[PDB]
Structure 1
Amino acid sequence: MKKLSGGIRTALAQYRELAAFSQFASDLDDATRKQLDHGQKVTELLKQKQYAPMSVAQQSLVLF
């Protein structure tokens, strides 16, 4: 988990400030288009149902 996840946290902080910038900006540079469209996938991946915990194998596979 330390290996597969060291990047996630800063990626999401920066994605969540960028996605704020984007409300006022259409006409986005494609290099930041990539960043928004990736951050959005990963944000969608981390939401989870209430009483369904995951073993570290199932989390590491998904994060991979």
Structure 2
Amino acid sequence: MKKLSGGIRTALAQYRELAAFSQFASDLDDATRKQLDHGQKVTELLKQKQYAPMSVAQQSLVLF
């Protein structure tokens, strides 16, 4: 998990830095559109239902 979470931190960091443009997404260059669309997806990935705990293997698998 220490290995895998390093990339999640930076994906969400760049996404939070670019978020301002999410409202003007059509104007953006595709070189950043990929960063924004990867950020939105890693953000949609961290959603989870109540009383549904994941063992460390499943969390690591999904973050991979």
Normalised-by-shorter TM-score class: 0.7 to 0.9
Q: TM-score, normalised by structure 2?
A: 0.85
Q: Which runs of 4+ in 1 moved over 2 A?
A: none
Aligned residues: 64
User: Which protein is richer in helix relative to its size?
Assistant: 2
RMSD: 1.4
**Is the 8 Å Cα contact of residues 4 and 60 (structure 2) preserved in structure 1?**
yes
Q: Percent identity?
A: 100
Q: TM-score, normalised by structure 1?
A: 0.85
The runs of 5 or more residues in structure 2 that have no matched partner are none
Q: CA deviation at 1:50?
A: 1.0
